[PDB]
Specification:
This is part of a larger assembly, with three copies of chain A, one copy of chain B (about 130 residues), one copy of chain C (about 110 residues) and three copies of chain D (about 120 residues). With about 450 residues, chain A is mainly beta. In chain A, the strands form eight sheets. In chain A, strands 16, 17, 18, 21, 22, 23, 24, 25, 27 and 28 form a ten-stranded mixed beta sheet that branches. With about 110 residues, chain C is mainly beta. Chain C has one domain. Chain C is about 0% helix and about 35% strand. Chain C is built from no helices and nine strands. A five-stranded antiparallel beta sheet of chain C has the order 4-3-2-8-9, with no helix packed on it. In chain C, strands 1, 5, 6 and 7 form a four-stranded antiparallel beta sheet that branches. Chain D has one domain. Chain D contains five helices and no strands. At the E-G interface, loops of E face helix 1 of G. Bound molecules: a molecule of 7 linked components (NAG-NAG-BMA-MAN-MAN-MAN-MAN), a molecule of 3 linked components (NAG-NAG-BMA), a molecule of 2 linked components (NAG-NAG) (2 copies) and 2-acetamido-2-deoxy-beta-D-glucopyranose (NAG) (11 copies). One 2-acetamido-2-deoxy-beta-D-glucopyranose binds next to helix 2 of chain A. The PDB classes it as viral protein/immune system. The entry lists the keywords bNAb, Env trimer, cryo-EM, RC1, VIRAL PROTEIN-IMMUNE SYSTEM complex. HIV-1 bNAb 1-55 in complex with modified BG505 SOSIP-based immunogen RC1 and 10-1074. Chains A, G, H: RC1 variant of HIV-1 Env glycoprotein gp120.
Chain lengths: ~450, ~130, ~110, ~120, ~120, ~120, ~45, ~50
């Protein structure tokens, strides 16, 4: 009985780190829910440790491709907007207006082909300031993204609201889920669970903020890789949601035209009402309390007497120096610089943010391809939660007491790293090896 | 393969310089190089060690400056996804030297999350006198 | 701020031996964020090594080097006439990054 | 009665009776080829483990016995410290670099068993 | 000498000698993805039934025996009225709602036959 | 210690000990559908041979014994000339036309054994 | 060919509910446009 | 030499030499390349 022999065991709870292919499960149309597996049933584990680590996972980098391929699939069979690149005779609509909106809302006229190729059609439309570029009385403007890209009109039948989907694993793989109250990026998890697939993950597109995301526990927690390093973004997560309200009070008109045989084009009509500017309202008291709470949370890493100073953005393109999101089918760009005022020392109104509208957008830097945004008829409103901010800090010398913090980011994976941080794909192996006193017969 | 920057411009004290560092020279090209790769700008004075000047991210051209050259350095790219620029206002007779632009993944790629400047491009010279 | 210094500033060697390019760090480098560059006067400064010890694409078998903590060494196996040029080491981490001063090999 | 992967943090002496909850779940447009790639990989990963257990004389069993002696160079641990304290995850990390020889050593115990029985059956 | 699915209407006592023709036919552009799904689905449907028979101690057999007793609450019929008058289609409809309780009960008889045989072989 | 397909020209009496190296290597964009068909074809070709060996009472074994006698009309060669002189490639060409009758005669020996064992175990 | 006859068995056959007459209706309209993809698009005829 | 049949003059004759013999050719013109934009998003590189 002393001479031990080796035995193999089938169906043994042991796993390894591996990457695999996740599929969709979610239960007119949207970009995602067209062909997915119809869907809880969790299993809790006890006193087993696991080294959870984000920013090196294989789930936030597969989703970054599974979102852009799904976006290209919803943009391929639509109408290709080739003949729009003509000379646009374009002047200022609503002249001598003493309001703020002066440079935008330009009226341009151009020729467009119809179903009969020998005949043309003169059409009138309104385009924003970020949609027309002058080229060398009325001036002759052209499109913004024509000389380096080919714009395609998006399909008006599909919608752009984020339907919550689930990334689900096949047989042989599992998803470890950390169920800790406080949990930073890299480290052990005291209580894990084995899940097939997760809760509602909203694939919302947003920069400089985290709209309609998952909530947190009773305390605000910050997350970074090596936060003394000022190169990685700081993914904070608020404990209570703060609401932002913005509408578009100009009454819209959407007019239809036929550019060719079988195709269609929905363009901007007139404005029947008042020429106003869209603006997002936030409550000042709870936002100031949230800023004080996240400053008190961030003060646990840099001592007591260090002056934390919130500042505005650095610059670059429009998707970092402003905040961009998607409301109902329209893409907004608001400056949000009224939320990062003067600094913080230890010893009933509403804040408005001016927000503009750009039709031609270019998401995920697809060179050679661009999408057109059709207008939405009527007044459209959007109320949104804010669960999480995107902050980064700068460097400095040794004698520096004013630690600055600017809202940057811009990475689309950071919006999916605040909702897939507590999940980890894992591959189980059913072959176990153990010695015992057993011996087979002859 | 290699990056391309041109310019042998002389300058006067009190002006601004513009250095464009493009990848694949033909203008109508879609390299996609300025798209998933960070880009470092590095100055070097003759008889002096080279110092860092500024990195630009490939996500939406969000720049990260240093504290020495903060208030007088703007840099971004145009509407096309090539040809990042370098505008250094507030000149001085101290920064006379060569300039370099290098490609760097900066730990954002899929294999191994490395930290290396795999290719440097050209190297222009900026002098200033009166 | 971590200052990066190099004590062998002037070096001279014959073609066909091993040379040691040492570098001292200030306070506790992370042993995975360091790079070496081969500079020259009016040429293209290329890279020779990744991190601690990992070769690049255009790098032969004769280039290597290791080190951890605050000391980092570059160990060239053999000396060629196409390698007599100055070398510059740099680190990574918090902005701004700082180079390692400067060293130079020579023929004698 | 623990569930799928329920005894992963338990003792190896207590996890040897719940081997069926992990052995029965190994088999159970853009997404047209995404869902098809997993149904081939799971079947291949199940069939590889079924082929590895078929050439050891353990095809159809969960806890089988072999004639290969356990060497002391792989692990110097006794019986009272493995099946009473260690879990199945801590034991796999100790013999992780010895899997490629034992899987060879379990092969020669098969061909030396089927041949020496074969001339026993020809008499 | 009946053929594939030839004894589907015969007696269960006479259809137990022709189980081989139903167990050997389970494995044997627009149409590029249509033909590829069938070769995955048939392999998966065969491997599911091969996995369900491998964890019951019946891997490699057709008519095996178990130790689970037959409860009288499922059916009150005797041996003389099942294997002499009823076919398989009329028998499958009578115990169609008791399949999920037998398939678990056949599982716990495996480890109970595997654990008690383990320590008997360790002596 | 020969390798994969190393004993292909060797003696059948000497190649019967190296049956492990051939039984373990059966499992291990324009090219997106080209690589997907090959794994499905390999899985089907492995599962067909695993199904043919599971209905003969030889599941999990490499060298098994059957009850079907060897007819003299298939080959008139003795034992001293088959396992000493001929290889497997020269032997497969001699019974290349008598495969489907041996494959049919091997199927009834499973049922004629299983029914008798079921009648013996019912007492 | 190669048919197999059966005895002593009845089956509840039912048309207007089968999944074969609704799969063929999709397979025909999915094969109709496949023979029109490499052909010439008749765009400039509408004069 | 290799062929399907030597006496059949319809099949090709593939020969294989024992030593590699070199062949050098250049294009001695400079052949500058110019570009033009043919439409939205495309490119056209023509002869200079
Ligand atoms: C973060 O999350 C929050 C969630 O809290 C998001 O906020 C919501 O965002 C959605 C975006 O889709 C908003 O939905 C839109 O609401 C529009 C306003 O309609 C409301 O007012 C009318 C007034 O009569 C009510 O009737 C509506 O009630 C409807 O819903 C209830 C639900 O029970 C039904 O019972 C009713 O019968 C109504 O059906 C709303 O309260 C609304 O117009 C809009 O609907 C258009 O789009 C859909 C999808 O395409 C069409 O099916 C529909 O017919 C509408 O179509 C328009 O365009 C076509 C173009 O041809 C025209 O022909 C039509 O006439 C019409 O003009 C849509 O449903 C929602 O209001 C909003 N708030 C709340 C509290 O839910 C944030 O957006 C999100 N932030 C992000 C993602 O950044
Ligand atoms: C994140 O970045 C920080 C800052 O670079 C890293 O901390 C550094 O860690 C090293 C050890 O790997 C420390 O070096 C040690 O220094 C002491 C003397 O101070 C010496 O006695 C030791 O033998 C060792 O060399 C270094 O001091 C430390 N730097 C700071 C500022 O604390 C850290 O490793 C990085 N990674 C993480 C947190 O995962
Ligand atoms: C967002 O708001 C800020 C603050 O109002 C704007 O910053 C102004 O920028 C101009 C440009 O030179 C300065 O002359 C002003 O002094 C700045 N304002 C203040 C109060 O300092 C900024 O332009 C706005 N827009 C964007 C896109 O950031
Ligand atoms: C494509 O068109 C855009 C829009 O005009 C060009 O962007 C402008 O380029 C000029 C070059 O003299 C700059 O002065 C402007 O500041 C640019 N406008 C911006 C950045 O909004 C772009 O250069 C064109 N691309 C070409 C010709 O390749
Ligand atoms: C984990 O919990 C189980 C019962 O829940 C217990 O038997 C076991 O000893 C525990 N392990 C440790 C290391 O405490
Ligand atoms: C449309 O074409 C006619 C043809 O001559 C031209 O006169 C007119 O100016 C064009 N329209 C615009 C807006 O340029
Ligand atoms: C995460 O939190 C734990 C708990 O205090 C700590 O030990 C660990 O160092 C933290 N890791 C990081 C990267 O902040
Ligand atoms: C925003 O909209 C919500 C919707 O109910 C409303 O309760 C709230 O008063 C509005 N204003 C602010 C400042 O939150
Ligand atoms: C924000 O909250 C703090 C609470 O510490 C309070 O002192 C301060 O007056 C509030 N308002 C502003 C504008 O900081
Ligand atoms: C900063 O102040 C808080 C007050 O609660 C204290 O707990 C903490 O220890 C202080 N930080 C340092 C580094 O002393
Ligand atoms: C923030 O508010 C203060 C209050 O007076 C104001 O002075 C400052 O200009 C504001 N910040 C911005 C960016 O407008
Ligand atoms: C906008 O214009 C339409 C056009 O008929 C009108 O019916 C509607 O009342 C107007 N106002 C709003 C708020 O939609
Ligand atoms: C914001 O969060 C609260 C928290 O429960 C939720 O009730 C509300 O619906 C959220 N608002 C949204 C999703 O617009
Ligand atoms: C079918 O039924 C008849 C009488 O009902 C019986 O004689 C016969 O054996 C049965 N089976 C077949 C295969 O005909
Ligand atoms: C060609 O021939 C030379 C010398 O005969 C040889 O060195 C070389 O490897 C050959 N192949 C190529 C591709 O140059």
């Amino acid at each position: 009985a002393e001479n031990l022999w080796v035995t193999v065991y089938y169906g043994v709870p042991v796993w390894k780190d591996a990457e695999t292919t996740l599929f969709c499960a979610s239960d007119h149309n949207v970009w995602a829910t067209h062909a997915c597996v119809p869907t809880p049933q969790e299993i809790h584990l006890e006193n087993v440790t696991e080294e959870f680590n984000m920013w090196k996972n294989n789930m936030v980098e597969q989703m970054h491709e599974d979102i852009i391929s799904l976006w290209d699939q919803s943009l391929k069979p639509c109408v290709k907007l080739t003949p729009l690149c003509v000379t646009l005779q374009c002047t200022n609509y609503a002249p001598n207006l003493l309001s703020n909106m002066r440079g935008e809302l330009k009226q341009c006229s151009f020729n467009m082909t119809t179903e009969l190729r020998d005949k043309k059609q003169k059409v009138y439309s309104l385009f924003y300031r970020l949609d027309v570029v002058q080229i060398n009385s009325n001036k002759e403007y052209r499109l913004i993204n024509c000389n380096t890209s080919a714009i395609t009109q998006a399909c008006p039948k599909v919608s752009f609201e984020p339907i919550p989907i689930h990334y689900c694993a096949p047989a042989g793989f599992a998803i470890l889920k950390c169920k800790d109250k406080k949990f930073n990026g890299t480290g052990p998890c005291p209580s894990v669970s084995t899940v097939q697939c997760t809760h509602g993950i909203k694939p919302v597109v947003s920069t400089q903020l985290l709209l309609n995301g998952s909530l947190a526990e009773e305390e605000v927690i910050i997350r970074s890789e090596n936060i003394t390093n000022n190169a990685k973004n700081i993914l904070v997560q608020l404990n209570t949601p703060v609401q932002i309200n913005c509408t578009r009070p100009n009454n819209n008109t959407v007019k239809s035209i036929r550019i060719g045989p079988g195709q269609a084009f929905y363009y901007f009509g007139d404005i029947i009402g008042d020429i106003r500017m869209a603006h997002c309202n936030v409550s000042k008291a709870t936002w100031n309390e949230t800023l004080g709470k996240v400053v008190k949370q961030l003060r646990k890493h840099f001592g007591n007497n260090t002056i934390i100073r919130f500042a505005q953005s650095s610059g670059g393109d429009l998707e970092v120096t402003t905040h961009s999101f998607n409301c109902g089918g329209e893409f907004f760009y608001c400056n949000t610089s009224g939320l990062f005022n003067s600094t913080w020392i230890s010893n009933n109104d509403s804040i408005v943010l001016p927000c503009r509208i750009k039709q031609i957008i270019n998401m995920w830097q697809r060179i050679g391809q661009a999408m057109y945004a059709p207008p939405i008829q009527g007044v459209i409103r959007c109320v949104s939660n804010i669960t999480g901010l995107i902050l980064t800090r700068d460097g400095g010398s040794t004698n520096s007491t004013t630690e600055t913090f600017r809202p940057g980011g811009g990475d689309m994976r950071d919006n999916w790293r605040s909702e897939l941080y507590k999940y980890k794909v894992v591959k189980i192996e059913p072959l176990g090896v153990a010695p015992t006193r057993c011996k087979r017969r002859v | 393969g290699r990056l391309f920057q041109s310019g042998t411009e002389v300058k006067r004290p009190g002006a601004s310089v513009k250095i464009s560092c493009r990848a694949d020279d033909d203008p109508y090209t879609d390299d996609d190089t300025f798209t998933k790769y960070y880009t470092h700008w590095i100055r070097q004075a003759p008889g002096q060690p080279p110092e860092w000047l500024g990195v630009i991210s490939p996500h939406f051209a969000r720049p990260i400056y240093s504290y020495k050259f903060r208030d007088r350095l703007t840099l971004t790219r145009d509407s096309s996804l090539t040809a990042v620029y370098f505008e250094l206002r507030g000149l001085q007779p101290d920064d006379t030297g060569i300039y370099f632009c290098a490609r760097d993944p900066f730990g954002d790629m899929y294999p191994h999350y490395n930290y290396h400047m795999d290719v440097w491009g050209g190297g222009t010279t900026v002098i200033v006198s009166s | 701020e971590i200052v990066l210094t190099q004590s062998p500033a002037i070096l001279s060697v014959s073609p066909g031996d091993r040379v040691i390019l040492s570098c001292k760090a200030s306070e506790g480098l992370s042993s995975s964020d360091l790079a070496w560059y081969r500079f020259k006067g009016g040429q293209i400064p290329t890279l020779v090594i990744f991190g601690a010890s990992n070769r690049a694409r255009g790098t032969p078998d004769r280039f290597s080097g290791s080190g951890s903590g605050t000391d980092f060494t570059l160990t060239i196996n053999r000396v060629e006439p196409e390698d007599f040029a100055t070398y510059y080491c740099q680190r990574y981490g918090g902005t701004p990054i700082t180079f390692g001063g400067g060293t130079k090999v020579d023929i004698k | 009665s623990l569930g799928f992967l329920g005894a992963a943090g338990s003792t190896m002496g207590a996890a040897s009776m719940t081997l069926t909850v992990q052995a029965r779940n190994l088999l159970s447009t853009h997404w047209g080829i995404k869902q098809l790639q997993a149904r081939v990989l799971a079947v291949e990963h199940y069939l590889r483990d079924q082929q590895l257990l078929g050439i050891w004389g353990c095809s159809g069993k969960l806890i089988c016995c072999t004639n290969v002696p356990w060497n002391s160079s792989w692990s110097n641990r006794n019986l009272s410290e493995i099946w009473d304290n260690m879990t199945w995850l801590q034991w796999d990390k100790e013999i992780s670099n010895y899997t490629q020889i034992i899987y060879g050593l379990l092969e020669e115990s098969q061909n030396q068993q089927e041949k020496n029985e074969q001339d026993l059956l020809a008499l």
